[PDB]
C-alpha cells in the first residue's frame, strides 16, 4: 500500500479517502483494518470474535454500487454489503461471498439481479450489539447463490425484493461494502465506487 495508509484497529467510524468508513469488533486485537486510497481498504484478522469492517457511506440508498475485492478467509467470514436502518431497526446484508458457512435464515424467496440470484432470508438476533446498543432485531439477507468477488450490486433491486417479500426496511444508517468475520481468521482487499 502507501506510507499514508492508515491501519485502525479500534472500534470507529469515520470518513477516508472521500468515503465512510466503519470498523467494529468485540475482539480488539484479533483483527484490523487498513485505509488504503480512494474506496479501497484492507482487513486483516486472526482467531477473531465478531468483527465488521469496511467503506462505503454514512447514509445507505439505492445505489448503484461497483466492487472488486480479494477474500480470504479461512473459517465464518462474508463479502457483503451490509447496512442498518432504524424503525424499523434492521441490519440488513447481500451477501456476496462467504467462508466456510453459507448464511441462511428464513426463506423468504429470491432475487434475481446483476447477474446473480440471491436467496432472501430474514433472521433475528437476540440482545446483540447494534447501531443503538444491546438489542433484538431483523437482519434481511440477500445470500447469493454462488460466491463473487467483484461485480455491481444494484441495491434498489435487493430492497425490493425484500419489500415484495413483506420485508419492511426503515431509516437508514450506514451502508459499507463490509468484510465480517465470525470466529475465524483471514484477509481481505475490497475496493468500491458508487
Ligand atoms: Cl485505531
Known amino acids: 500500500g502507501s506510507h499514508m495508509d492508515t491501519t485502525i484497529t479500534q472500534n470507529q467510524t469515520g470518513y477516508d479517502n472521500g468515503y465512510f468508513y466503519s470498523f467494529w469488533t468485540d475482539a480488539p486485537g484479533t483483527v484490523s483494518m487498513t485505509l488504503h486510497s480512494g474506496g479501497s481498504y484492507s482487513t486483516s484478522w486472526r482467531n477473531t470474535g465478531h468483527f465488521k469492517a469496511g467503506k462505503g457511506w454514512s ?65 433475528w438476533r437476540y440482545n446483540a450489539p447494534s447501531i443503538e446498543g444491546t438489542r433484538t432485531f431483523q437482519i434481511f439477507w ?5 460466491k463473487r468477488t467483484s461485480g455491481t450490486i444494484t441495491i434498489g433491486n435487493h430492497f425490493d425484493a425484500w419489500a415484495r417479500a413483506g420485508m419492511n426496511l426503515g431509516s437508514h444508517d450506514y451502508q459499507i461494502m463490509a468484510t465480517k468475520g465470525w470466529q475465524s481468521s483471514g484477509s481481505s482487499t475490497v475496493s468500491i465506487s458508487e
Open 59 to 123: 447514509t445507505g440508498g439505492r445505489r448503484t454500487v461497483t466492487y472488486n475485492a480479494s477474500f480470504n478467509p479461512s473459517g465464518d467470514a462474508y463479502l457483503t454489503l451490509y447496512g442498518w436502518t432504524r424503525n424499523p431497526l434492521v441490519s440488513y446484508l447481500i451477501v456476496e461471498s462467504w467462508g466456510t458457512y453459507r448464511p441462511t435464515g428464513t426463506y423468504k424467496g429470491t432475487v434475481t439481479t446483476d447477474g446473480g440470484t440471491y436467496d432472501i432470508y430474514e433472521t
Open 142 to 146: 440477500s445470500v447469493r447463490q454462488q
